Amino acid sequence: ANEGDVYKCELCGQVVKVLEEGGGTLVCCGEDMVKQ
């Protein structure tokens, strides 16, 4: 995921912003977070 991108977890509504780019896929509540 890229720096600055925002991801949301549709199961609990937690939203996070990427500060440092990395190669792994963001997961929350066992499900892939959705890129906003």
Added chain:
Amino acid sequence: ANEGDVYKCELCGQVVKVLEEGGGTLVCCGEDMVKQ
């Protein structure tokens, strides 16, 4: 996790900031992200 908290994944170094608080645990590269 709380709003404003910063999480890092030790396996790929991706860092994210919590914009909206949620009850799920943040995961990346299959592992729990570490609270900074």
